[PDB]
Design a protein around this ligand. Structure first.
Ligand SMILES: CC1=N[C@H](C(=O)O)[C@@H](O)CN1
Ligand SMILES: [Mg+2]
Length: 307
């Protein structure tokens, strides 16, 4: 059988690294093939739900509209900063490994893996050392509601847009900045048009890979185990790939542009942004009810356990 798999990124990007590894495992261990569609190579979620696609990698930044609980990742300063700790969290969290698959199942998706890509970094037309610096800045967000609220809380004017629109928008001042992991900033050449990088440490770009649930459930026990085994292999490979990635990417950027500036928020400057976080958490709960409170409680507990 041929299994169609779509993701959000380009050749060599983090999602593609995961994809290619997944594909590789399946092909190496079965008679099956995985057909991977990169960005633009085809609404990938719609296409998965209606069964055109078997697998899809979509980030909560988008999925958060359809699956409100997925917005949890956009609560600033909830997630740790340390790669090692984040990795431990993803491996061991019941929120991630037990609860979220339940939540996705409600939408007819079989959540296979959630994984981090990189720490979020702000880019803009100036350094941003304080919420005040955000004032009257149109900052692009991915298209989920909580994420807009986050940026509003930070003092910006959130402008949610599809990825396709971002480079151009920056270039002609439709937007004043955006947020993304460094590897994407680099691979996407965003630094060319948004040269001031600020490390706010407010969170991580994360993503998820899943299967159409009917498809998955429709597979033989053997093929199910294959898929699981492949996801585990891809995860492992991808985690190895991201170690040192941000550091390499930043070097790449510095090599490419003399105009790039890097601002790293100190502990004091961080607390100021952190002051804005609780209001976002409150909104999250108002969006997701008791089910949401339960997830958040587990999330926080999980975090505590790895720290
Ligand atoms: C890191 C990443 N950023 C894009 C975005 O910000 O829209 C996503 O669409 C895909 N991957
Ligand atoms: Mg084969």
């Amino acid at each position: 059988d041929n299994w169609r798999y779509a993701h959000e990124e380009y050749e060599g990007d983090v999602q593609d690294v995961f994809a290619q590894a997944f594909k590789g495992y399946v092909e190496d261990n079965s008679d099956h093939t995985v057909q991977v569609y990169r960005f633009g190579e085809l609404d990938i979620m719609e296409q998965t739900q209606n069964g055109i696609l078997q697998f899809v990698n979509q980030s909560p930044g988008f999925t958060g509209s359809l699956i409100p609980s997925a917005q949890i990742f956009f609560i600033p300063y909830l997630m740790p900063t340390d790669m090692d700790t984040v990795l431990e969290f993803f491996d061991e969290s019941k929120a991630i490994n037990e609860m979220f698959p339940k939540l996705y199942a409600e939408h007819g998706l079989e959540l296979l893996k959630m994984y981090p890509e990189g720490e979020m970094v702000v880019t803009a037309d100036e350094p941003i050392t304080s919420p005040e610096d955000f004032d009257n800045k149109k900052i692009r967000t991915m298209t989920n509601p909580l994420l807009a609220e986050t940026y509003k809380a930070f003092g910006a004017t959130p402008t949610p847009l599809p990825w396709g629109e971002v480079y151009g928008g920056l270039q002609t001042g439709i937007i004043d900045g955006q947020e993304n992991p460094i590897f994407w900033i680099e691979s996407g050449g965003l630094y060319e048009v948004s040269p001031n990088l600020t490390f706010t440490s407010h969170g991580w770009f994360t993503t998820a890979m899943m299967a159409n649930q009917d498809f998955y459930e429709g597979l033989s026990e053997e093929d199910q185990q294959l898929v699981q085994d492949a996801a585990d292999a891809a995860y492992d490979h991808t985690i190895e790939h991201i170690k040192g990635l941000s550091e390499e990417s930043l070097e790449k950027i510095k090599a490419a542009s003399d105009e790039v500036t890097v601002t790293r928020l100190n502990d004091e400057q961080i607390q100021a942004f952190k002051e804005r976080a609780p209001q976002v958490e409150e909104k999250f709960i108002e969006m997701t009810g008791e089910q949401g409170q339960e997830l958040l409680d587990q999330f926080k507990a999980d975090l505590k356990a790895v720290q």
